[PDB]
């Protein structure tokens, strides 16, 4: 069970799928969206 | 389906808390059987 469930969503290029992961640096993770080292959570994606 | 394997992101500057520790666990049983591993202590003579 969880207290504080938050859900996040946007569009990326397959080049940038690895950049969503904690500690990874690259101009999307530098300037658009990044997440903390103890991130208690999961990434999910598909082509669109 | 995941074959249960992963690899720690062991990097030099990155890991704090999420850092590698080398662990050694010593296990033993004592005062319940013959003994072969023993403290530095020296025997006395035996008096009856």
From Swiss-Prot, chain A:
Region (Integrin-binding motif): 13-15
Function: Attaches the virion to the cell membrane by interacting with host receptor, initiating the infection. The major receptor is host ACE2. When S2/S2' has been cleaved, binding to the receptor triggers direct fusion at the cell membrane. When S2/S2' has not been cleaved, binding to the receptor results in internalization of the virus by endocytosis using host TFRC and GRM2 and leading to fusion of the virion membrane with the host endosomal membrane. Alternatively, may use NRP1/NRP2 and integrin as entry receptors.
Subunit composition and interactions: Binds to host ACE2. RBD also interacts with the N-linked glycan on 'Asn-90' of ACE2. Cleavage of S generates a polybasic C-terminal sequence on S1 that binds to host Neuropilin-1 (NRP1) and Neuropilin-2 (NRP2) receptors. Interacts with host integrin alpha-5/beta-1 (ITGA5:ITGB1) and with ACE2 in complex with integrin alpha-5/beta-1 (ITGA5:ITGB1). May interact via cytoplasmic c-terminus with M protein. May interact (via N-terminus) with host bilirubin and biliverdin, thereby preventing antibody binding to the SARS-CoV-2 spike NTD via an allosteric mechanism.
Protein name: Spike protein S1
Organism field: Severe acute respiratory syndrome coronavirus 2 (2019-nCoV)
Lineage: Viruses, Riboviria, Orthornavirae, Pisuviricota, Pisoniviricetes
From Swiss-Prot, chain B:
Annotated stretches, region: Disordered: 32-48
Outcome of substituting residue 32 to P: Increased resistance to human covalescent sera neutralization
UniProt effect for mutating residue 9 to S: In strain: Omicron/BA.1
Superkingdom: Viruses
Chain's role: Attaches the virion to the cell membrane by interacting with host receptor, initiating the infection. The major receptor is host ACE2. When S2/S2' has been cleaved, binding to the receptor triggers direct fusion at the cell membrane. When S2/S2' has not been cleaved, binding to the receptor results in internalization of the virus by endocytosis using host TFRC and GRM2 and leading to fusion of the virion membrane with the host endosomal membrane. Alternatively, may use NRP1/NRP2 and integrin as entry receptors.
Subunit description: Binds to host ACE2. RBD also interacts with the N-linked glycan on 'Asn-90' of ACE2. Cleavage of S generates a polybasic C-terminal sequence on S1 that binds to host Neuropilin-1 (NRP1) and Neuropilin-2 (NRP2) receptors. Interacts with host integrin alpha-5/beta-1 (ITGA5:ITGB1) and with ACE2 in complex with integrin alpha-5/beta-1 (ITGA5:ITGB1). May interact via cytoplasmic c-terminus with M protein. May interact (via N-terminus) with host bilirubin and biliverdin, thereby preventing antibody binding to the SARS-CoV-2 spike NTD via an allosteric mechanism.
Protein name per the record: Spike protein S1
Taxonomic source organism: Severe acute respiratory syndrome coronavirus 2
First-to-last residue of the parent protein present: 488 to 535 of 1273
């Amino acid at each position: 069970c969880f207290t504080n469930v938050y859900a996040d969503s946007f569009v990326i290029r397959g080049n940038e799928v690895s950049q969503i992961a904690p500690g990874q640096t690259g101009n999307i993770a530098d300037y658009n969206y990044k997440l903390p080292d103890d991130f208690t959570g999961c990434v999910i994606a598909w082509n669109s | 389906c995941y074959f249960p394997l992963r690899s720690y992101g062991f990097r030099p500057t990155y890991g704090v808390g999420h850092q590698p520790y080398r662990v050694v666990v010593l296990s033993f049983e004592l005062l319940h059987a013959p003994a072969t591993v023993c403290g530095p202590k020296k025997s006395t003579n035996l008096v009856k």
